[PDB]
């Protein structure tokens, strides 16, 4: 009940907007670079 | 018979004595600390706390939540006036040595 | 001068994908209805949660 | 522990005060009087009249912190506050000067007065034998006698320098009659208000009003007031000899006390150490010394501004905290 | 610059956290660190083509014996004078100029060369200040030229930025009352009472060797050198110290504030000099309902003074994207923005 | 005094005209600032 | 990951409104000795 | 003219164009009104999810009410404190509008 | 958030909420808004609000706890060294929630050398304050200087 | 810019020690701390303000409008 639960609402439901939160997400904050 | 001084807080209180909530405005630490001492060696007293909800503003929650026997109230009632108690002692000794010096 | 670029670095970084969202298919779609990716992540599933 | 408070090096130990039968199997020492009070006792110092000291027993933190705080704030007391201006010249910012002002003491009995109203305005608020107000107004006058240059700017400019003796007073009707034996003083009539030259005046009138610690220190009757909690140290065996001797010097002057060489070293008092605690520091003097201070006794002194006496600030201090409780009870609380 | 105050160096009122400072009533009321706040606004006066000086008329005095509350902020002269509390809405100076003092003169008059729109400059702000200095006097092309300094105390209210000398910046966090943060023996009762957390992470024991160093200095009756490589050293202040009774490590028992008990471990305090920086709150806090528009681009204006509006930027936009709230953007950047109605024709969009 | 106001230097009681001038007479220097009312004048000391 | 936010953080809000007290009244603070090397170290360091 | 090269003869491709040009700060960049600026401080005992904000800009810091129904006895009352003391309001607007 | 007033004059909110924003106090000036129409605001509250965002996404993780003090008074409370009696215990779980609750006492830490609780414990309670408190947790793992 | 009448922890009275102290210290040269204690200043909060505050006010006074 917990896991399925979990995993369940464990989800990108429709809407929540991806690309903006991957923006956000990514930039903060032998020689080789 | 100001009807502003405390008042029983029916949001934390469940029934009968047990736990009382009251909130006493217009008083400080001097009280609360004064007093705790007092009440939880009352033998039903059992969790007597205080504290400011936040210096920010002057409002002073004390805390009562005993057992069964006697009830919430009675307990402040007694050991209050028992703290009066204490300052007639004070008092007494205090003005005594004094007066003989 | 780090935080500069880096600040700009998220100003352009949003900019090409300032605008990908998440659809009723469970399809990550753009705006005009171009689909960048089916599932999201192959799972769907919020990183957050 | 047994009314001692651990003393270590690195921490302290045993502290909240312990003595109610909430914690012991064997459950004890449960309010009542009686045995508080035939056990309850109390000591004296000294006294002053500006100042006291005295020794304290066999009661709690709470109700002697509570004393210390409602004596630092809330007992009342009769100091200026509102503050009125006829002109002025003089260099300090009036707004400067006016704080001065009112946070100097003033000696005069308080309850000689009632409290003041916040409702009614204007004259209903300072009236009579609710109110004092007082008054300044000097120009300096140079001093046509100038013996020297740079001497001091009296010798050049007469009354430069103005003094709490320079403050005056404007008694009126019932005012007046009331206070003949008691005339206003200003606690140390000497104090450095403001410095002034010719053709330089400063005239003014404000309110000494009775007001409440709490809110300002320039209410305080009580320059300071504190507990410094009694220490007992405690020896073991004789240790004595070159570095007994030494072990005193590890301690302020009075401390302990060489009696002789096979006599060691006996405490004269306690109380006369600050519980520096550097017996802890050289550590070879550590495993036959310990450390402690009592809850049960109170060292205790009360620096009073010199209003009144501090034997009677004390003495109200409680009486403030018995009209309190006495007052609360009589309540009925809502429901 | 600053002030000389006891600290003592604790978590104590969890006000504090991390760098706030936090102070002492019954200090502060006694004094400690206060500011007088000084400002001059000057008003030039100059004569104009026509012929006519722009004037300091005023004192109206309406109402049978007084000026009007708004005009009450004078005496005969018609100008600001020494002494007086000011209350926002009031004119700190009278400045009447001609109407048509900007128009083309002829070789004409006759009686009235009056036409004043007069604009007295109004002193603005949240809390009154005075005027206790003024200054009528001449520039170099003989004008009248009026000269007028302004001034407030500021009692160091909550958020203040209280420098401590030796690189720890901070607010001044909730102030206490009195009896609240610790006393001690001879009931010594820090003033400034500050953090410990920002001494391990900023890394700065040098101060922390500043505070024995004064109570030393104090207890043997002496300021205290310190210099770089030099000043007085430290092993030498703990036979200081000890002598007078104070533990060589700096260090005493402190007593709750609160339950007047002992503290459970020994506090580290004595005398630090600090300092009171620019950057008052009071100046700073700024706050619009809805404040005036920018004629070009018809929205609020620029930063603090003039008036208000705050920045959304882009980079501070888009942050509103990632939880996706759509009216939240409407009502910022829209029904709260710029409100607007445009009209159109279906036929040719124009 | 009662008049109106002072030099800055010479630092005497002067009075003035309307619309006359500002520079002083014991002196002939320009400016010169604004003696203090005669009117009351209240704070609160706190 | 539980009970869901509003008592999850109002965990959170009873935490700090006991810390701030609580640390507070016992008290917390550095003393030179904490940061002052005892003898000893000294030596060792001053070999390495 | 001048001459002496006065430089920034500019003025349009360039109000649209950077930074404070408008097209991006000036437009999605909107300074936006009914806000409020202060410097900050701690307040533990104030629970998360929440702000301290101070009396003295909520009396300058308004928001827009639809009254109805259960509002009055609220609302008829916030009017008579006014502008002045914090638990009241300033402006009205009425159904005619 | 829910918006608070009280005196003086400065923003203030609850120092765990820091960290998202990484304020130093100090100088920092924040940027206060209002909203206008109402979905706006269920919209921010009910959304964009702390409890809600109260993981930070990009890790999957509660940005948002408490810090320095907070951290470190726990730490004093928390540790095995500690003990407390009934009035201490008292008094602290009246400090860490002002009032207003019900509670309940484990049977005491020790027994009939005196009784106690330990930090453990009164940090349980932290918790679980009460029977009827929906907080029922297991939980382990490393912390640091293990 | 005078001796503040109280200090800013006891708030014991400064006032009439200054001059007396500032005398004390000219007329019968002697160490500073010794004189406070023979003066009667103990609690060191009380006797920085002796130790230190700077009178600006006598260097004032040689600016002043009136002369
Ligand atoms: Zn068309
Ligand atoms: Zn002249
Ligand atoms: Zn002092």
């Given at each position: 009940?917990?896991?399925?639960?979990?995993?369940?609402?464990?989800?990108?439901?429709?809407?929540?907007?991806?690309?903006?939160?991957?923006?956000?997400?990514?930039?903060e904050p032998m020689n080789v670079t | 018979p100001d009807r502003e001084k405390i008042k029983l807080l029916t949001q934390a209180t469940s029934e009968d004595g047990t736990s009382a909530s009251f909130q006493i405005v217009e008083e400080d630490h001097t009280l609360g600390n004064a007093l705790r001492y007092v009440i939880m060696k009352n033998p039903d007293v059992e969790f007597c706390g205080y504290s400011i909800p936040h210096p920010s503003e002057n409002l002073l929650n004390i805390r009562i939540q005993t057992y069964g026997e006697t009830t919430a109230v009675d307990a402040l009632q007694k050991g209050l006036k028992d703290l009066m108690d204490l300052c007639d002692v004070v008092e007494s000794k205090f003005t005594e040595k004094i007066k003989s010096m | 001068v780090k935080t500069a670029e880096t600040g700009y670095m998220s100003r352009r970084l949003m900019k090409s994908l300032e605008d990908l969202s998440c659809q009723y298919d469970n399809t990550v779609r753009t705006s005009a209805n171009g689909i960048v990716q089916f599932t999201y992540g192959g799972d769907g599933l919020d990183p957050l949660e | 522990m047994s009314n001692i408070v651990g003393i270590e090096y690195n921490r302290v130990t045993n502290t909240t005060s312990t003595d109610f039968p909430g914690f012991s199997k064997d459950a004890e020492n449960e309010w009542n009087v009686e045995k508080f009070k035939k056990d309850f006792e109390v000591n004296i110092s000294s006294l002053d009249a500006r100042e006291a000291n005295f020794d304290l027993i066999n009661i709690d933190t709470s109700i002697a912190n509570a004393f210390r705080r409602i004596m630092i704030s809330e007992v009342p007391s009769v100091a200026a506050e509102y503050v009125y201006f006829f002109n002025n010249t003089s260099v300090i910012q009036d707004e400067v000067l006016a704080h001065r002002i009112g946070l100097v003491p003033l000696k005069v009995d308080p309850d000689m007065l009632t409290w003041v109203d916040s409702n009614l305005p204007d004259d209903e608020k300072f009236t009579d034998e609710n109110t004092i107000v007082l008054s300044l107004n000097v120009k300096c006058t140079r001093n046509p006698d100038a013996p020297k240059g740079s001497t001091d700017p009296k010798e050049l400019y007469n009354n430069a320098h103005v003094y709490a003796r320079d403050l005056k007073f404007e008694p009126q009707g019932r005012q007046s009659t009331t206070f003949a034996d008691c005339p206003v003083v200003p606690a140390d009539p000497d104090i450095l208000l403001?410095?002034?030259?010719?053709?330089?005046?400063?005239?003014?009138?404000?309110?000494?009003?009775?007001?409440?610690?709490?809110?300002?220190?320039?209410?305080?009757?009580?320059?300071?007031?504190?507990?410094?909690?009694?220490?007992?140290?405690?020896?073991?065996?004789?240790?004595?000899?070159?570095?007994?001797?030494?072990?005193?010097?590890?301690?302020?002057?009075?401390?302990?006390?060489?009696?002789?060489?096979?006599?060691e070293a006996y405490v004269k008092d306690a109380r006369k150490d600050t519980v520096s605690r550097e017996v802890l520091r050289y550590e070879e003097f550590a495993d036959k010394v310990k450390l402690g201070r009592v809850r049960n006794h109170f060292i205790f002194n009360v620096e009073s501004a010199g209003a009144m006496t501090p034997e009677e600030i004390f003495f109200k201090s409680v009486r403030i905290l018995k009209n309190k409780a006495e007052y609360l009870k009589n309540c009925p609380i809502t429901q | 610059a600053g002030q000389n105050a006891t600290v003592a160096v604790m978590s104590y009122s969890g006000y504090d956290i991390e760098d706030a400072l936090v102070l002492n009533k019954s200090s502060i009321d006694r004094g400690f660190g206060r500011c007088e706040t000084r400002r001059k606004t000057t008003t030039v006066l100059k004569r104009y083509?026509?012929?006519?000086?722009?004037?300091?008329?005023?004192?109206?005095?309406?109402?049978?014996?007084?000026?009007?509350?708004?005009?009450?902020?004078?005496?005969?002269?018609?100008?600001?004078?020494?002494?007086?509390?000011?209350?926002?809405?009031?004119?700190?100076?009278?400045?009447?100029?001609?109407?048509?003092?900007?128009?083309?003169?002829?070789?004409?008059?006759?009686?009235?060369?009056?036409?004043?729109?007069?604009?007295?400059?109004?002193?603005?702000?949240?809390?009154?200040?005075?005027?206790?200095?003024?200054?009528?006097?001449?520039?170099?092309?003989?004008?009248?030229?009026?000269?007028?300094?302004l001034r407030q105390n500021r009692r160091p209210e909550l958020g203040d930025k209280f420098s401590s000398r030796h690189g720890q910046k901070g607010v001044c966090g909730i102030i206490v009352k009195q009896e609240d943060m610790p006393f001690n023996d001879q009931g010594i009762v820090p003033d400034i009472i500050m953090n410990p957390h920002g001494f391990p992470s900023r890394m700065t024991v040098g101060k922390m060797i500043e505070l024995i160093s004064g109570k030393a200095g104090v207890l043997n009756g002496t300021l205290e050198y310190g210099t770089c490589f030099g000043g007085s050293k430290l092993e030498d202040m703990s036979k200081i110290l000890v002598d007078q009774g104070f533990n060589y490590s700096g260090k005493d028992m402190l007593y709750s504030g609160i339950t007047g008990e002992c503290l459970q471990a020994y506090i580290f305090f004595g005398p630090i000099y600090y300092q009171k920086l620019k950057h008052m709150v009071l100046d700073k806090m700024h706050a619009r309902a809805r404040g005036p528009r920018a004629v070009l681009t018809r929205q609020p204006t620029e930063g603090r003074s003039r008036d208000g509006g705050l920045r959304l930027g882009e980079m501070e936009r888009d942050c509103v994207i990632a939880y996706g709230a759509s009216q939240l953007l409407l009502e910022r950047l829209m029904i709260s923005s710029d409100a607007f109605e445009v009209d159109v024709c279906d036929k040719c969009g124009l | 005094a009662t008049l109106k106001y002072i030099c800055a230097e010479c630092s005497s009681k002067l009075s003035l005209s309307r619309t006359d001038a500002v520079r002083c007479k014991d002196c002939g220097h320009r400016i010169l600032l604004k003696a203090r009312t005669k009117r009351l004048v209240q704070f609160e000391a706190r | 990951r539980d009970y869901g936010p509003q008592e999850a953080a109002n965990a959170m809000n009873r935490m700090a409104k006991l810390c701030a007290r609580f640390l507070g009244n016992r008290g917390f603070s550095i003393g030179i000795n904490d940061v002052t090397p005892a003898d000893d170290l000294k030596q060792k360091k001053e070999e390495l | 003219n001048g001459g002496g090269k006065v430089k920034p003869i500019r003025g349009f491709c360039q109000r649209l164009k950077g930074k404070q040009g408008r097209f991006r700060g000036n437009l999605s960049g909107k300074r936006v009104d009914f806000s409020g600026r202060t410097v900050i401080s701690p307040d533990p005992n104030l629970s998360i999810d929440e702000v301290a904000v101070p009396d003295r800009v909520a009396k300058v810091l308004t928001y827009p009410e639809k009254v109805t129904r259960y509002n009055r006895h609220k609302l008829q009352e916030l009017i008579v404190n006014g502008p002045n003391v914090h638990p009241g309001a300033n402006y009205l607007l009425k159904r005619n509008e | 958030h829910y918006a608070k007033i009280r005196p003086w004059r400065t923003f203030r909110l609850n120092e765990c909420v820091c960290t998202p924003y990484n304020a130093d106090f100090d100088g920092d000036e924040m940027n206060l808004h209002v909203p206008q129409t109402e979905e706006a605001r269920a919209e921010a509250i009910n959304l964009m609000g702390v409890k809600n965002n109260l993981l930070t996404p990009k890790s999957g993780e509660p940005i948002i706890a408490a810090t320095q003090d907070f951290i470190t008074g726990s730490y004093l409370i928390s540790h095995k060294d500690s003990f407390y009696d009934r009035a201490?215990?008292?008094?602290?779980?009246?400090?860490?929630?002002?009032?207003?609750?019900?509670?309940?006492?484990?049977?005491?830490?020790?027994?009939?050398?005196?009784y106690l609780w330990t930090g453990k414990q009164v940090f349980s309670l932290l918790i679980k304050p009460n029977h009827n408190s929906p907080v029922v947790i297991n939980l382990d793992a490393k912390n640091k200087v293990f | 810019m005078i001796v503040p009448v109280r200090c800013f922890s006891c708030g014991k009275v400064v006032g009439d020690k200054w001059e007396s102290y500032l005398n004390l210290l000219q007329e019968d040269e002697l160490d500073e701390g010794t004189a406070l204690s023979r003066l009667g200043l103990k609690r060191y909060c009380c006797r920085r303000m002796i130790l230190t505050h700077v009178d600006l006010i006598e260097k004032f006074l040689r600016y002043n409008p009136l002369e």
């Open positions: 009940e917990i896991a399925l639960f979990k995993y369940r609402k464990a989800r990108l439901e429709p809407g929540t907007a991806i690309g903006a939160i991957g923006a956000q997400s990514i930039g | - | - | 403001a410095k002034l030259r010719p053709g330089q005046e400063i005239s003014l009138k404000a309110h000494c009003i009775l007001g409440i610690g709490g809110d300002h220190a320039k209410f305080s009757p009580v320059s300071t007031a504190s507990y410094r909690l009694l220490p007992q140290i405690n020896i073991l065996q004789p240790i004595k000899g070159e570095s007994a001797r030494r072990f005193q010097k590890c301690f302020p002057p009075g401390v302990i006390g060489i009696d002789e060489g096979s006599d | 083509a026509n012929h006519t000086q722009d004037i300091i008329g005023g004192m109206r005095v309406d109402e049978n014996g007084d000026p009007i509350w708004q005009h009450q902020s004078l005496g005969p002269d018609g100008l600001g004078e020494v002494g007086m509390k000011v209350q926002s809405g009031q004119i700190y100076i009278n400045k009447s100029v001609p109407t048509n003092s900007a128009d083309a003169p002829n070789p004409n008059n006759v009686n009235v060369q009056t036409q004043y729109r007069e604009a007295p400059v109004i002193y603005r702000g949240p809390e009154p200040s005075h005027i206790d200095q003024v200054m009528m006097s001449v520039s170099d092309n003989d004008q009248a030229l009026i000269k007028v300094l | - | - | - | 201490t215990l008292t008094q602290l779980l009246s400090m860490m929630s002002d009032g207003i609750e019900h509670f309940d006492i484990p049977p005491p830490a020790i027994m009939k050398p005196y | -």
